């Protein structure tokens, strides 16, 4: 309330004004108890700041620190700001200037531009980038896609070592394991069987606790599939669980079909059925069927599996669902080979192999920051031209990061330097609709959703083409969909919406290439969108509220008189909902529909809409009343036929 | 009873007589369910057998199969004999012939000699050697001494990988970790502390379950010492335990002194106090003291630690105790550097480093097999000349193994090919005393103990010198104690007992060198001594008994009439003891004293006696009535001042 300005001003008093000196102190820092020099600034940036201190110092507007809300700021204080002896040594403006420097280096102009735009809350980078940009070993990447190196104790243990090295930095991990033999499989030069995936998973669970959570990806034909999906079950059978990892399903179309037509589904060990995961679509279904005929696996009723999956999803919120064929059919990285997993949050879709660990850097544009009253006043509209301009900057930022990143494992560096994937997202979609007074489920919200993503995708590809004009295309550009002028929406066999000129862009892409093989992967924004004060990513609100009420809701309630006590009381004891409320104008009830009150068919529709402008995928959480087995089935099947890549992230419940 | 000959004869009927054809089948074996060729014989041995089948086939005396006792044989059946489809395919004589071939290869003479001696129960090799000799990848080594590679996630994870690779074969492991930083130590490029050894130990616990148990060695100055010693406590605090690993203490003299004089004892993290474990004796105590002065650690009352250690030992039977300074002062491997651990069973004492994993092969001579009635009859004496002759063979066997072994990790191969350690032990010491009617605690038992070990040590060094005459000394012989003619007893500053000529031997050792840097490490015999029907290693009996009574006890009881029912009943309800029994001749009571009834001062004495003829160390289990804190202290301090290497293995209780 008045608490934010209390908390912030007190930071100002126990904090040196003058960025150049705070840099000096951070860089000079020394661990008191150990006597060890422990710089929190890189040599590289310290120097830059020193050779420019007056220019840097006077660019900072410390006014801007007061713009975070109490809980927003305390998020920064608790985690993001650099500490000395447990004492905050960084102002929010220092944080930002440092991050800018860590990205742009000697490009002072760009650095100030990034600074200004971030300080004004036009956009922000992901948490790893906020933590580490400008610091000695800047691990700024958020995502790592890891291939299980080989079905052996060496391969497994080499992979575990690699995950430890990754997770120790700020790295989230998606790990696919389709090549690990199942329970009871033969092991040369022994006499006892194999105990399958679960024990091996216990090992990874254990390494995560010791050290970036893990998601594990598995296709549903793997013989250990029934236990795998139940990892997070809290009525655990104990040594058969793994409460700290996440099951994600890598689902082929064939499975969905088998389920649908109430048919059979055969389980295999990778050893008995090689190559399943190194092909997709038709090639897979030809290979699959043959292995079925040849008796290599164990056939079941497909709907038994489907049923179990639903039971785990209902009970635990997992496994996630990501459709393997959508991902490979519609990836600009398909010239690299078959993609075998997504990531921790199911938005990244990139090629990984034993020698190549996929990496991504994330940033999110703040959608509401482009809302403005038109040339008159009776409106407030949306400035797609500014949105376009900022996306071009974020695209350049994210690309700079590729080069200035400290890579934890050589596999990650090899992978990223070759293909240069990038991932832009959004926060404040639900705010944006609310400021324009568009219900989430409305035809204008549907329209605006489409438009926003077309300009972000266009702008990013435009920035990226411009970069390829400067530095050449990424190593593997030749032979990709984009080199032919196939873009994301084309692969969904759709015409773009037309707000921007795609023909010219496509012309230059074919002529000059693009610096980045991918650019768009709407991610969970979480902590960053609490810093900025907006709603998570692209989702609607979960509730409109000695608590904190929705600000736009509040404005409206007050503006109509009906805000008071026997009123306030009503929302609290109604979990942020305003439906079935005695005296609220219908239009507010529709504008402030909470996600439990919005059709999921609508959610999926809009996801599908925007999906045509998404190089990769997006973290589609799904929300259910009291879940029902039939409703989940309808939900998944709707999204699958909608051609979604990520059919589901979490299944949020009740 | 008559059950053994029942069980054995039935094996004969479901088993092909003719070793050459059983080899054929094993070598031809194929996994029915998988269709995979799964040979259980190496190409190398299969061929040898084929080119000699008539010679091999007709050397086997299948009579000898009937000589194992029911429970002895069923030990072989349950674990040792090669199976086909869960069906025993090996006779005990095949097992042995195969093992012999796997060791000697094309040396058919030696192979038959090993066969004859083993089939007659003159000696046996350790279980890994019985499992794997002659098979495709023959991992015949029992012991692996592993250096923690480095205090980093890489080093730790590389070490874990290495232990997994080792433990997956038949390998037991001793792992020293004195270089791992403790709880709260600083970690460069992070903000949270270090959580110390216990979490890292949870990782190793977890890898042992997934895959050769682990013993972990730690010196008592390590800052995590109090939790480390409590690993096996069953009133666990849960995530602070590790119920599947064993704490062993690597104790410097300085600690014992500090305890003794009720003084201080300082704890360090390796990071704050480098080099502690890379020196010993005076060099250590100089370095230690300086770090004490310089305030680098946390000083305590030494007896607090001592007290806790006793509490864990009382409650769990661990930690084991192995005196680091005895081990380094009196090791022929001291020219290699400072020895940092023993092994899983506290008998191996060899140098290990990040690039060198110490390895050993074990065999045990059956002591009772050299007892014979003298040239007349009124005796039964001991044939030290035969004992000497057999030890020479076992020494040659164990040396052959060094060359024919498949090493699981390159570190192990590098280490063993350089130094060629060997480890001979014994079983049936308690039987031998009983057959000669010498109470364990008697002056003749004390004498015989000394003599037996002097000839085993002499014979082994003699065999080994002979081998060095054939093949040259081991790579690092020059500069060692032995190259100067210092032998084990010399390093205890004692004259040998004199039953064999040490001067000539020492002369030839100095002239020609020795093939093996070590030769003697009396180990737990366990399963092998149930196969052979004798008592474990060098320990006394634990009890003299719808059960099974001590055979020599029985002979005597019967021979005096007093054996019956109100008699039988008496031992059962007396846990194998015969003391305080109404009508037993005093001499039997002393001859059949159970280990709970034998003074531990005596045990330790004899250990010390034989210790002068032990290149390495021996697995000294200690046995207590109802333990007392003062008695344990007396026990340890007695052994320490006796100059024991392994002060204690398990603490057997009640």
């Amino acid at each position: 309330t008045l608490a934010a300005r209390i908390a912030i001003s007190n930071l100002h008093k126990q904090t040196t004004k003058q960025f150049s000196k705070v840099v000096e102190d951070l860089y000079r820092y020394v661990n008191a108890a150990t006597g060890k020099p422990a710089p929190m600034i890189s040599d590289d940036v310290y120097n830059i700041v020193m050779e420019n201190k007056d220019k840097l110092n006077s660019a900072i507007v410390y006014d801007r620190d007061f713009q975070y809300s109490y809980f927003g700021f305390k998020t920064l204080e608790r985690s993001y700001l650099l500490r000395i002896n447990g004492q905050v040594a960084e102002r929010p403006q220092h944080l930002i200037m440092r991050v800018a420097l860590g990205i742009h280096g000697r490009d002072i102009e760009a650095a100030l531009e990034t600074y200004n735009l971030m300080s004004l809350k036009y956009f922000t980078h992901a948490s790893p980038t906020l933590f580490n940009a400008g610091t000695p070993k800047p691990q700024m990447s958020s995502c790592f896609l890891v291939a299980m190196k080989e079905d052996s104790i060496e391969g497994i243990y080499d992979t575990l070592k690699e995950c430890a090295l990754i997770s120790k930095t700020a790295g989230g991990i998606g790990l696919h394991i389709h090549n690990i033999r199942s329970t009871g499989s033969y092991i040369a030069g022994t006499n006892g069987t194999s105990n399958g995936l679960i024990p091996m998973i216990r090992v990874f669970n254990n390494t995560a606790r010791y050290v970036g959570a893990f998601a594990l990806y598995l296709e549903p034909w793997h013989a250990d599939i029934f236990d795998f999906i139940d990892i997070r079950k809290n009525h655990g059978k104990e040594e058969i669980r793994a409460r700290d990892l996440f099951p994600a399903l890598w689902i082929p179309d064939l499975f969905m079909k088998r389920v649908e037509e109430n048919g059979t589904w055969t389980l295999f060990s990778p050893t008995s059925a090689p190559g399943l995961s190194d092909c997709y679509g038709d090639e897979f279904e030809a290979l699959y069927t043959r292995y079925e005929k040849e008796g290599r696996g164990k056939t079941i009723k497909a709907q038994k599996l489907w049923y179990s999956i639903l039971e785990a999803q209902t009970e635990t919120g997992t496994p996630f669902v990501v459709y393997k064929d959508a991902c490979n059919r519609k990836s600009n990285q398909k010239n690299l080979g078959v993609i075998k997993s997504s990531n921790l949050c199911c938005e990244i879709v990139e090629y990984s192999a034993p020698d190549e660990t996929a990496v991504c850097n994330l940033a999110s544009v703040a959608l509401p920051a482009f809302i403005e009253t038109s040339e008159d006043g009776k409106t407030s509209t949306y400035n797609f031209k500014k949105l376009h301009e900022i996306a071009k900057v974020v695209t350049r930022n994210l690309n700079r990061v590729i080069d200035r990143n400290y890579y934890p494992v050589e596999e990650a560096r090899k992978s990223n330097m070759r293909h240069r994937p990038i991932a832009l997202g959004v926060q404040g979609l639900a705010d944006t609709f609310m400021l324009l007074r568009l219900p989430f489920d409305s035809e204008e919200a549907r329209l605006l959703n489409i438009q926003i993503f077309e300009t972000i995708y266009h702008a990013s590809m435009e920035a990226s083409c411009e970069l390829a004009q400067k530095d050449g295309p990424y190593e593997t550009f030749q032979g990709s969909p984009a080199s032919q002028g196939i873009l994301q929406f084309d692969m969904w066999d759709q015409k773009p919406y037309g707000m921007w000129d795609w023909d010219t862009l496509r012309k230059d892409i074919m002529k000059h290439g693009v610096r980045n093989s991918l650019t768009m992967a709407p991610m969970p924004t979480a902590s960053t969108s609490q810093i900025l004060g907006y709603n998570e990513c692209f989702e609607p609100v979960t509730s409109n509220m000695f608590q904190v009420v929705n600000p736009y809701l509040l404005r409206d309630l007050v503006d109509l008189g009906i805000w008071d006590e026997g009123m306030k009381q009503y929302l609290i004891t109604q979990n942020g909902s305003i439906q079935g409320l005695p005296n609220v104008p219908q239009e507010l009830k529709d504008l402030y529909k909470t996600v439990w009150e919005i059709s999921q068919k609508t959610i999926i529709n809009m996801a599908a809409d925007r999906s045509v402008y998404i190089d990769q995928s997006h973290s589609l959480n799904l929300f259910l009343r009291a879940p029902t087995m039939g409703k989940l089935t309808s939900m998944h099947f709707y999204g699958w036929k909608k051609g979604l890549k990520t059919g589901m992230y979490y299944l949020r419940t009740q």
Side-chain angles (χ1 to χ4, degrees), chain A residues 156 227 285 318 472 608:
Chain A
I156 297 170
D227 293 334
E285 274 143 50
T318 66

Side-chain angles (χ1 to χ4, degrees), chain A residues 167 202-212 214 243-245:
Chain A
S167 186
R202 265 208 66 210
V203 175
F204 276 86
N205 192 85
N206 205 282
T207 279
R209 290 176 64 92
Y210 178 64
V211 304
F214 295 19
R243 282 233 64 271
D244 219 288
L245 289 333

Side-chain angles (χ1 to χ4, degrees), chain A residues 245-261:
Chain A
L245 289 333
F246 298 84
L249 286 182
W250 198 231
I251 312 189
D253 289 348
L254 205 239
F255 173 71
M256 290 310 281
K257 296 184 188 181
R258 291 297 181 87
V259 175
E260 196 178 30
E261 66 209 14

Side-chain angles (χ1 to χ4, degrees), chain A residues 363-365 367 424-429 453 456 522-523 525 536-538:
Chain A
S364 69
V365 170
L367 297 177
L424 291 82
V426 303
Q427 62 186 66
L429 213 225
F453 284 94
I456 305 178
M523 73 291 303
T525 49
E536 255 250 28
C537 56
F538 43 84

Side-chain angles (χ1 to χ4, degrees), chain A residues 443-470:
Chain A
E443 165 55 18
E444 291 86 19
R446 167 191 172 276
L447 212 345
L448 179 59
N449 178 67
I450 301 194
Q451 307 178 323
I452 293 186
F453 284 94
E454 187 198 24
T455 106
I456 305 178
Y457 180 39
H458 181 275
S460 74
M461 291 289 272
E462 174 165 285
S464 183
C465 186
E466 292 168 2
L467 282 156
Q469 281 170 224
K470 285 192 162 57

Side-chain angles (χ1 to χ4, degrees), chain A residues 108-154:
Chain A
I108 302 297
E109 249 37 41
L112 286 337
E113 178 189 43
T114 287
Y115 168 85
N116 281 323
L117 301 158
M118 286 184 72
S119 53
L120 307 170
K121 301 202 326 177
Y122 277 98
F123 72 85
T124 200
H125 289 252
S127 298
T129 294
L130 306 180
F131 296 144
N132 299 335
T135 72
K137 300 182 185 155
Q139 205 300 100
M140 291 158 281
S141 309
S142 308
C143 314
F144 290 88
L145 301 236
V146 182
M148 173 65 68
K149 305 188 168 271
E150 163 182 291
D151 195 4
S152 72
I153 289 291
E154 226 212 54

